[PDB]
Design an enzyme around this catalytic site. Structure first.
Site, PDB file in Angstrom:
ATOM      1  N   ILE A   1      31.632  -9.585 -55.732  1.00 15.38           N
ATOM      2  CA  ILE A   1      30.271 -10.061 -55.919  1.00 15.38           C
ATOM      3  C   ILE A   1      30.041 -11.427 -55.298  1.00 15.38           C
ATOM      4  O   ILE A   1      28.910 -11.920 -55.315  1.00 15.38           O
ATOM      5  CB  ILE A   1      29.892 -10.082 -57.413  1.00 15.38           C
ATOM      6  CG1 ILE A   1      30.948 -10.839 -58.220  1.00 15.38           C
ATOM      7  CG2 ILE A   1      29.758  -8.667 -57.937  1.00 15.38           C
ATOM      8  CD1 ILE A   1      30.656 -10.891 -59.708  1.00 15.38           C
ATOM      9  N   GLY A   2      31.080 -12.054 -54.764  1.00 14.74           N
ATOM     10  CA  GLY A   2      30.948 -13.341 -54.111  1.00 14.74           C
ATOM     11  C   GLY A   2      32.318 -13.807 -53.674  1.00 14.74           C
ATOM     12  O   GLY A   2      33.347 -13.330 -54.166  1.00 14.74           O
TER      13      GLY A   2
ATOM     14  N   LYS B   1      37.364 -14.522 -60.969  1.00 14.96           N
ATOM     15  CA  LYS B   1      37.483 -15.419 -59.830  1.00 14.96           C
ATOM     16  C   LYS B   1      38.957 -15.624 -59.517  1.00 14.96           C
ATOM     17  O   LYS B   1      39.747 -15.916 -60.417  1.00 14.96           O
ATOM     18  CB  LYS B   1      36.811 -16.763 -60.118  1.00 14.96           C
ATOM     19  CG  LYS B   1      36.938 -17.762 -58.984  1.00 14.96           C
ATOM     20  CD  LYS B   1      35.837 -18.807 -59.037  1.00 14.96           C
ATOM     21  CE  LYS B   1      35.844 -19.665 -57.781  1.00 14.96           C
ATOM     22  NZ  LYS B   1      35.416 -21.064 -58.047  1.00 14.96           N
TER      23      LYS B   1
ATOM     24  N   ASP C   1      28.269 -29.257 -56.006  1.00 11.43           N
ATOM     25  CA  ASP C   1      27.910 -28.100 -55.191  1.00 11.43           C
ATOM     26  C   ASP C   1      26.704 -27.385 -55.782  1.00 11.43           C
ATOM     27  O   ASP C   1      26.676 -26.154 -55.878  1.00 11.43           O
ATOM     28  CB  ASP C   1      29.082 -27.133 -55.029  1.00 11.43           C
ATOM     29  CG  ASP C   1      28.943 -26.258 -53.794  1.00 11.43           C
ATOM     30  OD1 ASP C   1      28.104 -26.590 -52.930  1.00 11.43           O
ATOM     31  OD2 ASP C   1      29.675 -25.253 -53.673  1.00 11.43           O
TER      32      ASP C   1
ATOM     33  N   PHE D   1      35.882 -21.862 -52.058  1.00 14.02           N
ATOM     34  CA  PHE D   1      37.242 -22.039 -52.561  1.00 14.02           C
ATOM     35  C   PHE D   1      37.783 -20.839 -53.302  1.00 14.02           C
ATOM     36  O   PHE D   1      38.923 -20.900 -53.773  1.00 14.02           O
ATOM     37  CB  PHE D   1      37.370 -23.260 -53.471  1.00 14.02           C
ATOM     38  CG  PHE D   1      37.601 -24.534 -52.741  1.00 14.02           C
ATOM     39  CD1 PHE D   1      37.987 -24.515 -51.413  1.00 14.02           C
ATOM     40  CD2 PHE D   1      37.543 -25.746 -53.403  1.00 14.02           C
ATOM     41  CE1 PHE D   1      38.253 -25.685 -50.740  1.00 14.02           C
ATOM     42  CE2 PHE D   1      37.807 -26.922 -52.736  1.00 14.02           C
ATOM     43  CZ  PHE D   1      38.162 -26.892 -51.402  1.00 14.02           C
ATOM     44  N   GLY D   2      37.037 -19.753 -53.417  1.00 13.99           N
ATOM     45  CA  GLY D   2      37.606 -18.619 -54.112  1.00 13.99           C
ATOM     46  C   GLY D   2      36.826 -17.359 -53.835  1.00 13.99           C
ATOM     47  O   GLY D   2      35.797 -17.369 -53.155  1.00 13.99           O
ATOM     48  N   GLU D   3      37.353 -16.267 -54.371  1.00 10.82           N
ATOM     49  CA  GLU D   3      36.754 -14.946 -54.311  1.00 10.82           C
ATOM     50  C   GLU D   3      36.484 -14.513 -55.743  1.00 10.82           C
ATOM     51  O   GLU D   3      37.327 -14.712 -56.620  1.00 10.82           O
ATOM     52  CB  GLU D   3      37.704 -13.986 -53.607  1.00 10.82           C
ATOM     53  CG  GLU D   3      37.973 -14.410 -52.185  1.00 10.82           C
ATOM     54  CD  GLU D   3      38.763 -13.377 -51.383  1.00 10.82           C
ATOM     55  OE1 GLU D   3      38.286 -12.241 -51.182  1.00 10.82           O
ATOM     56  OE2 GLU D   3      39.887 -13.701 -50.942  1.00 10.82           O
TER      57      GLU D   3
HETATM   58  C1  VSY Z   1      31.632 -20.878 -63.694  1.00  7.60           C
HETATM   59  C2  VSY Z   1      33.059 -21.323 -63.899  1.00  7.60           C
HETATM   60  C3  VSY Z   1      33.949 -21.123 -62.640  1.00  7.60           C
HETATM   61  C4  VSY Z   1      35.248 -20.465 -63.021  1.00  7.60           C
HETATM   62  O1  VSY Z   1      34.263 -22.374 -62.044  1.00  7.60           O
HETATM   63  C5  VSY Z   1      33.226 -20.307 -61.651  1.00  7.60           C
HETATM   64  C6  VSY Z   1      32.747 -19.538 -60.861  1.00  7.60           C
HETATM   65  C7  VSY Z   1      32.016 -18.718 -59.942  1.00  7.60           C
HETATM   66  C8  VSY Z   1      31.258 -17.649 -60.392  1.00  7.60           C
HETATM   67  C9  VSY Z   1      30.567 -16.890 -59.463  1.00  7.60           C
HETATM   68  C10 VSY Z   1      30.630 -17.211 -58.095  1.00  7.60           C
HETATM   69  C11 VSY Z   1      31.408 -18.322 -57.704  1.00  7.60           C
HETATM   70  N1  VSY Z   1      32.071 -19.040 -58.636  1.00  7.60           N
HETATM   71  C12 VSY Z   1      29.813 -16.244 -57.460  1.00  7.60           C
HETATM   72  N2  VSY Z   1      29.303 -15.399 -58.343  1.00  7.60           N
HETATM   73  N3  VSY Z   1      29.756 -15.782 -59.589  1.00  7.60           N
HETATM   74  C13 VSY Z   1      29.385 -15.063 -60.755  1.00  7.60           C
HETATM   75  C14 VSY Z   1      28.518 -13.995 -60.696  1.00  7.60           C
HETATM   76  C15 VSY Z   1      28.226 -13.357 -61.879  1.00  7.60           C
HETATM   77  N4  VSY Z   1      28.752 -13.735 -63.048  1.00  7.60           N
HETATM   78  C16 VSY Z   1      29.602 -14.792 -63.017  1.00  7.60           C
HETATM   79  N5  VSY Z   1      30.145 -15.194 -64.168  1.00  7.60           N
HETATM   80  N6  VSY Z   1      29.934 -15.464 -61.898  1.00  7.60           N
END
Ligand code: VSY
Length: 290
Positions: free
Chosen positions: A18-19, A41, A132, A23-25
Site C-alpha cells: 500500500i506504500g 511497515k 515529513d 525509508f520503508g515499505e
Molecule cells: C505511523 C507510525 C510509523 C510506523 O512510523 C509509520 C508509518 C507509515 C504508514 C504508512 C505509510 C508510510 N509509513 C504509507 N501508508 N501507511 C499506512 C496506510 C494505511 N494505514 C497505515 N497504518 N499506514
C-alpha cells in the site's frame, strides 16, 4: 521486498503493498491471530537507514492521542525490521487525486487543516519534530468511530528536539534533508536544522495545494532547484484565492526560527475564523463522502 502471501513471523500475512519507496515499505496484512487487517511497515536491516526503532519510540510516546495509529507489534530478523500498526483508510494525496479538479472544497481543506494542526501539536508536545509533513502521510480512519478522523503517518524522519528535562537542544549548524521536496520549508532546503515552524510550513503548503490544486513547483524534480523558486517566490500570491486570514498564518510562521515556540492558537484561529466566515459546520460531509 516482501512478496504477497509472505507471513511475517507466522502471524502477519502480506496481502498487498500500500506504500513504499521512502525509508520503508508498508503492506496491508492479515493478522492471523486477531483476524483483523493491519498495516505492516518493513525496513531492510541492510539499508543505510536505521529508523524503525525510533518510529516505535515516537509511536508509543503518542499512544492514546488522537490522530495516532495504535501500535500492534514490532520485530527484527537478519533481513528486515518491521512494525505492525492499526490499518487506516485512504491517504490525503490519494483523495486529492481522486477529486475531479484536483482540489478539495474549502470546507474540507480547512477542517483537514485543523486536524493536521492538532496532530502536529501532539508530536511537538512529546518533544519530536515530524519533518515529513505531506498529504500522503495522513489518512482517514477506517472504523465507525474513526472515519472522520485524520491519522498522522510515517515517523521515519522524526527527530527529538527536546531533551530529558523538556529543554530544547541546540540545533546543529547544518542537517541533511532526506524528506519530500514539494512541501519542505526553505529552511529545510538550506540544510538548516528544522524546527517546529518547518512542520507548519509544510502544513501551509499542503493547504494551498488542497484548495488550489497545485503548487508552482509541482512538476519540478530537482530539489535544489525547487528551493530556489520558494526562496524567490512571493508567497502572498499563493494566497490569492485562500481566505484572507491565511496572511496571518503566513506572516507568523515566516517570523519564526528554530528557537521560538509557534503560536499554535493563532493558526488554529485562522482555520476557525475562516470556517465561521463561510458558515462551514464542523460536522459537514467531507468531499469524498459525496
Ligand atoms: C505511523 C507510525 C510509523 C510506523 O512510523 C509509520 C508509518 C507509515 C504508514 C504508512 C505509510 C508510510 N509509513 C504509507 N501508508 N501507511 C499506512 C496506510 C494505511 N494505514 C497505515 N497504518 N499506514
Amino acid at each position: 521486498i516482501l512478496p504477497a502471501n509472505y507471513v511475517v513471523k507466522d502471524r502477519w500475512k502480506v496481502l498487498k503493498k500500500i506504500g513504499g519507496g521512502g525509508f520503508g515499505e508498508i503492506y496491508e496484512a492479515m493478522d492471523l491471530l486477531t483476524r483483523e487487517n493491519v498495516a505492516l511497515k518493513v525496513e531492510s536491516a541492510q539499508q543505510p537507514k536505521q529508523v524503525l526503532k525510533m518510529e516505535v519510540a515516537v509511536l508509543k510516546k503518542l499512544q492514546g492521542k488522537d490522530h495516532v495509529c495504535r501500535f500492534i507489534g514490532c520485530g527484527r530478523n537478519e533481513k528486515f525490521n518491521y512494525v505492525v500498526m492499526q490499518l487506516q483508510g485512504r491517504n490525503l494525496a490519494d483523495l486529492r487525486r481522486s477529486q475531479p479538479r484536483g482540489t478539495f472544497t474549502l470546507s474540507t481543506t480547512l477542517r483537514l487543516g485543523k486536524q493536521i494542526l492538532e496532530s502536529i501539536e501532539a508530536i511537538h508536545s512529546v518533544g519530536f519534530l515530524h519533518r515529513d509533513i505531506k498529504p500522503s502521510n495522513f489518512a482517514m480512519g477506517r472504523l465507525p468511530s474513526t472515519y472522520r478522523k485524520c491519522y498522522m503517518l510515517d515517523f521515519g524522519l522524526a527527530r527529538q528536539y527536546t531533551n530529558t528535562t523538556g529543554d530544547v537542544r541546540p540545533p546543529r549548524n547544518v542537517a541533511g534533508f532526506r524528506g519530500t521536496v514539494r512541501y519542505a520549508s526553505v529552511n529545510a532546503h538550506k540544510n538548516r536544522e528544522m524546527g517546529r515552524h518547518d512542520d507548519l510550513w509544510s502544513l501551509f503548503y499542503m493547504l494551498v495545494e488542497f484548495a488550489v490544486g497545485q503548487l508552482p513547483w509541482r512538476k519540478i524534480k530537482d530539489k535544489e532547484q525547487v528551493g530556489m523558486i520558494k526562496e524567490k517566490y512571493e508567497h502572498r500570491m499563493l494566497l490569492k484565492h485562500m481566505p484572507s486570514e491565511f496572511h496571518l498564518f503566513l506572516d507568523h510562521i515566516a517570523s519564526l526560527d528554530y528557537f521560538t515556540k509557534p503560536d499554535y492558537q493563532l493558526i488554529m484561529s485562522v482555520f476557525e475564523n475562516s470556517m465561521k466566515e463561510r458558515g462551514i459546520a464542523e460536522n459537514e460531509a467531507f468531499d469524498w463522502e459525496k
